[model samples]
Target chain A: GHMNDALHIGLPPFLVQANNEPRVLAAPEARMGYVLELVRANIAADGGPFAAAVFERDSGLLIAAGTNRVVPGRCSAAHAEILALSLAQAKLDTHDLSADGLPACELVTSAEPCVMCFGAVIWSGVRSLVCAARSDDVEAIGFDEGPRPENWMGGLEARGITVTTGLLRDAACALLREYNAC
Target chain B: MNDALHIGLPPFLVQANNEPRVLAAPEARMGYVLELVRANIAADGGPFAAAVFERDSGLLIAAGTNRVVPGRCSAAHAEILALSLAQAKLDTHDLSADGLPACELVTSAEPCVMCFGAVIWSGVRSLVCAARSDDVEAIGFDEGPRPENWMGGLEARGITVTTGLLRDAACALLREYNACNGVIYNARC
Candidate 1:
């Protein structure tokens, strides 16, 4: 029987596992450490274009951690937020995982989420967002952050997702500056 | 975390829900691509839309348009969207793995610098562009990364490139998007 090879077609997977069920870093201080670890990984050339992590808001139990692997993987959708959320979803075993009606999970990034990641964050049903830098801070490095609606924050708030900015603002901005300098 | 417990990343390949359809005529394909751009403008209000087709076979693979400003993901360029979807159809990661098997990319405008990289790496065998990138750049958008460099590289990589397929029509679409307050995020803008 000449069986035709079931040729699979589509964008290649962009997510790469850096940590699965990483040690629970429930405290703000330890969470910052996780973000810094990713930043350092990017700095050390072990990660992607950027880095991010997803953790439960209450216990701060780390769900998953991801870094940008777009260039290497050739999947542009492989932003840190997207990877982290996707990994978290797979771990939780739900197609539409939500924190609002369930255990709260938050997305923490070394830098502000870009437009694509922002959409993923909203749609991924995350309960909260925490970031270290602003979009303008990233633009200073010559990467267009894209057309982020001026009212994006308000839109998220309307959906009941609380946002906390500037968790380690200077540190995050400094890392971006360092990335751009090189 | 035990390394053994680490779950592998989901494969990029997705079984294309949209089956391939052949539209053998070039003019028809050009018109279809234009219609897609208009459709995107109507549906998502983005400035662009792009579709991929098998060059020799003329099979419609996938279509995509701008989702950046509206969708808030810098990665949402129309070309990327279409290309990504097409890849999902083929269930393969590296489009260029076997050189896209005679594929063609048709776009409303010459792709911006960001999209140009995607075109090259995507392994499409040929490109047919309607409007030039400058047409959009003139209207407050910055389409830098200079098409010339990678465009030349296109021929270097055995890819055929065509320009000005429907110049006036595509330009008119650009004008429409510009009039609608289409944003330009470049530093120079």
Candidate 2:
């Protein structure tokens, strides 16, 4: 009976596993390392593009992963962090994406969140952020990061969100270059 | 066995499969695109509307309008919305693939910097513009970092760009949107 519904409407290709599954990350380095792995996996997935993941900062459980599906999805709103945050919010069942349910979750992205994704990072209630490449770094490959405010990082910090950068930066930058070349 | 994947996601995030609706010559589609922008103004109280269409046939692929002031998402630009839906309709996550059918992007205005990058990365074959980017800025919505500021224009990137097809009509929508409720930017209008 259920198969018939899928046959009629069709099954979506993407999947989101939202649970408090467990993984070990001894330190911030390990956590950053895991996020880098997610980004690398995204690069490997199809045409080798940017990707991102959201992690349950405490247990290190994978919440959701987002690749640059904007081109495929035909919506710029499907940025890696947007997909990760949206999927995470759906799985968590929170309306405002409050910290009570999220409980110190961190967003890890392959490239620095652009102006739009930066707003999403703050709004999605992620307590911390870890990005591999900088916004300028991505723009070097011909992709515009948009006009981010001068004190964008300061604004995030003021709102109680911590940020970490330059983790495996070279590798992430290389991925953007590879994506543009293709 | 629980064979089903409970992938309960928001309906808004999941785009519906909309095939390209074939139309006549390029000029015929201008009114439709303009009406789309007007509908956006009536429904969402925003200033922009854009869509992607088949370049050769001028078939409607997908359309996107603004939703920033209404507190939906900051990045939900007109071109971004339409382009994203087009990708979903095709059901292939990679737009850069050469195997896919060619498509052209049509917008009410010359794309802002954000939309411009999306147009490039999404691998749309060509671009058709109705209004100028400066026209949007005239209304107080700052269009950041355009191709003109860059060393080489969008044409240099292999995406054929055509501008000023129905310039007066598209700008009329922009003027109407501003008269209703001008965009209040963080720093500027």
Candidate 3:
């Protein structure tokens, strides 16, 4: 499958000499979670771009996770969803999947999922995709990929692909309003 | 349902202040995946840590798709298994969920499910949890959070936890390392 293929092919040129450590990792997990939670809450309510992490079950190590939106110098929801699907698909391609055949997924987005954004992960065969986004005086914009095939309404316009499942939700709302004024 | 959740989320604390906008937008789906990949590489291939900037497939954007391991990273494999199970448990928590909608339950490391619940309890709940040993050598030993899956006998020792995903930057670094087959053992030789 794609997982094996990617692995066999090996890393590409763009990823050399990169460092994965985030300054946040220096803080406590709870603190990190708290910081991410703040971002998650904002995405849920007001709606803005955000990012999050996910980890393995046994080892509790990070496996495959993705960012969900692009705002404040971040990727957009459309781009994030596609990338998350890609991440999940990659995991399935390689790992010794359990009976569920899906991995634990986490998300933190700038905007909540709309009908289309949610459908991406579901179509990608994800058992569960945990998402977080900001919510406050925000709007969801849709892109038309092509001729909106019979069942392709949910697909992103950038790539003529169709999404079958998933839905967008209000990521961060209560707090955004609290932090900001109407 | 998790996905249908339209309620409480946390708030944003960071601010760029340049655009006069808050900096707490939840990352796009792909952005989160980028962080997931980064965390994975840090735990498995080397001793590095990771963070997500662009999010959404950090490995491809920053890490370079060329470095992905054939099949899967052991760390990612374990995370996948756990996440799937956690989803299933969420269904029961919500009294029989049909599908993906339950994805929006909450955003804390303290997940409600017992299976994922326990996993979160081991101090690896929502961040990269490293150990005392398990050095990858490529990134050099700096005593970071030991990954639950990538190190050794992960199942037996449950002292780590994260959001069940990979880190983007770390993933990119791994891709680079793998491009050179995990660093030059004898660059001078």
Candidate 4:
């Protein structure tokens, strides 16, 4: 089966339906609201508490959205950032989002990317990154979030990708707490 | 495929040969994976390769080559594909899960920062690389946003790490990709 079918990552049914909602969130904070809803909805699933969505930076069109599918899918690389970015790339049919003649895109997530997603963000071609919770929050909730570059913000910045954090910070962290407590 | 999404490798790769490819011993495994790197360069694909093997028997579990541009997926690096492929092959995401033999990843080159976390999360117990991260950068690639001494990080997580397995051969493949004018698919526009 490995040779016949491509090893892939997929979103849960709830995320797919939510992602199909026909609306644009104009503000970055508003987009975080959608991502948090995804995180909250994901609490019912057998996955972790994280979610991310990619949008057209200017028009705020929801190109793609995803929640964590790690445990349910049994794929560790199946982080919300990974699925949202990859699914967006698949929908657009391009490896690079910032490819010439395309609109700049942004990634809005409920929490800061772990080290893995941090590297994925650099290669995802998104122009801006928006995060609600810090990596410390992710670890504080008992997740081994992994080692990140001490100057990770600089790393993304060096590549011309803009970064923003703490949009609805406490609210997002509470979801992690909510997930952990359950 | 609503609840499920499928990302496929190259058609030719997915139609795996009737006879599975298998290798024995670390030297033999590295040589096989290096040849895959050579093949990718000749095909004008990315100059990287990775494969999974049983820790003791060295049975090739899965093979992965860089297909970022062609596949239209940036995260389709060889290491990611290799881990993902092996997981799919065995039907378990966590290779470290009980009831499975210890697995080792034999990659043509050292993992970047992305693959570093991926390795830990993948549950692989061992990692072997032919070229160091320096060789990759010398040929115009970033090792990514990772701290120094990646081996230590993996070791801290109980993953054994080995580097410079066949440095000369792996570095040659990098040069071949450059000479062939292969696309350098680093992100950020």
Candidate 5:
């Protein structure tokens, strides 16, 4: 006899502050730099050890930012990529990020997405995906990457989303290593 | 800049007035999903519907239909919402977490790749499908790049899968949606 309806995933206070305005970081390196910071903040605050954001690909405007809230938010689907992509659509007032009148939006992540997040990227309408660490590295740190296509990047490419990986590799893995003994 | 994704219960729940509803068979479960699909059409959403139920006792935990366009969030697929809402209602991210009952996902159609991975993370013990992936594709909805051995992936993780429950009726609802020209919300790929 249980009945009710509603669901929510939230950012911590720091991320809410980060979302207070439209900010720009021109290069993928610069964009990844900010993403790595979100990862560190989430980890330091004892949230999930990941983070991601959506941005205007050419203009580099920050549309939305989010950290992994799988444990904290009580939704396994609350991965960083899903959070950022969903929040970006909410900001744009359209389900598709690539909707008419909006410039190309790119997703920047501190680590490569797991399979669920990989699927999310395909549906999110982002034109590109930028990642700092590899899925191999993520699994090596004791996180489950889930089973995905052998050529995961190939799936994204086929979907017309350009993928960039290993940006700021050492810095990104540095944070992942923090959870090595956890 | 928002953090929440909202989904509401359909009018059927209001009529229930807190009564217990049990769905013990696959057809009954799928019939509920098809009804949700029809309700979704009335609400002007996608033809898909999914629910989470207690695997053994058949207790309906939550119900969700596609809200991609209305919710303005690409992650608003029925499977994701049903899983999320069930977790929210149960107050645990893992439905199979210790001290909780085993759960199953009853979806009106085969999961797209996105929902396929979602089912993996959802912690459900079983997946019950009413329609095949091709049925969804027949209606022009992209299932994405689901791996050929998709079932193996779930079984490898200890979840069981039983597909093709009430397939004809499920496909009938899909054709009904096709007749109405329900909007297909695939990204611009």
Candidate 6:
């Protein structure tokens, strides 16, 4: 009578199966937890600005208002535009106001940062910006789809939008998720 | 000998190559500056939620969130069930919101979260969700059509916002759909 291991008396049959599906393993919550743990661990692992990683599809990644990184990959420049809006909300919660720390927040992405997202950032009142792009001299330079619709802070020389920092990580974690895997 | 110590002015060089690594270090400060700017950008509004995503096929993959799947499923995920229900089978696409309270809680891609939160704030839902039948379609399409990596602006569809349970249920349903070709339809609003 120890917890009834056998199936009987209207009990369903015992069934056990091993799942090896990769998708099953890589879930939004799992990814969310993974990134959260990674970031929580990273802050202590190395001294850097990347406080958190935001996933594209759905990952539970959030950072406090003091300071954090914004990394964009692929069409994320547009995504960044949306992120600026989200960040504003988080920032407001901490400071109890919107017009205080709008410009100092930095954004990082795969391609060159753009103006549209820049505008969103600026609309949000953020000034510092950075984009991973081919080059300004090139005819067609593209960055992540996160940015919205604003010009770069320091003219166009600041990799598309103007805001704060413009340092590039060899591989933004967002891009790494979709591309190369470490 | 002292006169020989004079050196020529160093030539200025331009490193124009596009390096992805250089941006990381500065992004730290950039992140700081962004927060500072966002805090003060608009004297009017504040930031909220953002990000959303869906695939062309039921690529039942989520790197984050809980390990177990929820019992409720999205009607859109039930290609056969929906079709059968449409074809005189039992009614489908109706699940109580309480069945899955965390409908909004099921996480997604980074941008997905960013987009969903933004979409939720925008006062809209009902995104065009999709998933490939096979993994091949996940990465490559037959005609090479652009993948539905993220439900680009599906939140802009302007559907009536309700409990927003369809998306998460649909996600779970895809993991082990009842039957037939998976169906992708409007949900979460």
Tell me the lDDT of candidate 5: 0.84
A87-172 in candidate 1: lDDT tens per residue? 66656654344734668888888777655566567656788888877777877877545434456677568777888877887877
Clashing pairs in 2: A73-B84, A74-B83, A74-B84, A74-B85, A75-B84, B140-B189
lDDT of 1 by residue, B1-189 (tens): 121112211111111214455778877777777876666666554667777888888888776666544443344567777776666556544465664566788887887655665676566778888888778777776564332365676677787888888888888877876666537554421
Candidate 2 per-residue C-alpha lDDT over B1-189 given as tens digits, one digit per residue, 9 for 90 to 100: 011112221223222223336656666666667777777676653666667777776667666665443433444567766676566556544454666767887777877655766676576878888887778788987665343443145677678887786889988888877766745553322
| Model 6 bad stretches (over 4 Å) | A1-81, A94-111, A114-116, A131-166, A173-182, B1-189
Give the DockQ (C-alpha) for candidate 4: 0.59
lDDT of 3 by residue, B20-118 (tens): 221133333324334433444443432132221211222111111111233232222222222322322232212113442312111211111111222
lDDT of each: 0.63, 0.61, 0.29, 0.83, 0.84, 0.24
DockQ of every predicted complex: 0.05, 0.16, 0.04, 0.59, 0.57, 0.02
RMSD of 4: 3.8
Give the per-residue lDDT digits (tens) of candidate 6, residues B18-117: 1111222222322322232123112112111111111222111111111001101110011111111111111112111123211111121122222233
- Which parts of model 2 have CA positions greater than 4 angstroms off? A1-15, A18-31, A40-50, A53-65, A68-79, A85-107, A112-130, A133-165, A168-182, B1-20, B68-71, B93-101, B147-151, B182-189
lDDT of 4 by residue, A5-34 (tens): 576666667887865677688988788998
TM-score of chain A of 5: 0.95
Chain A TM-score for candidate 4 is 0.95
lDDT, residue A67, candidate 2: 63
Q: Point out the worst 10-residue segment of candidate 5 chain B by lDDT.
A: B10-19
- Candidate 1's chain A scores what TM-score? 0.84
Q: In order of the candidates, what TM-score does chain B achieve?
A: 0.80, 0.80, 0.26, 0.88, 0.89, 0.17
Lowest-scoring 10 consecutive residues by lDDT in candidate 2 chain B? B1-10
lDDT score of model 1?
0.63
Find the candidate with the highest TM-score and give its number.
Answer: 5
After superposition, the stretches of candidate 5 with alpha carbons farther than 4 Å from their true spots are: A1-3, B1-3, B7-19, B182-189
Worst 10 residues of 6 chain B by lDDT: B5-14
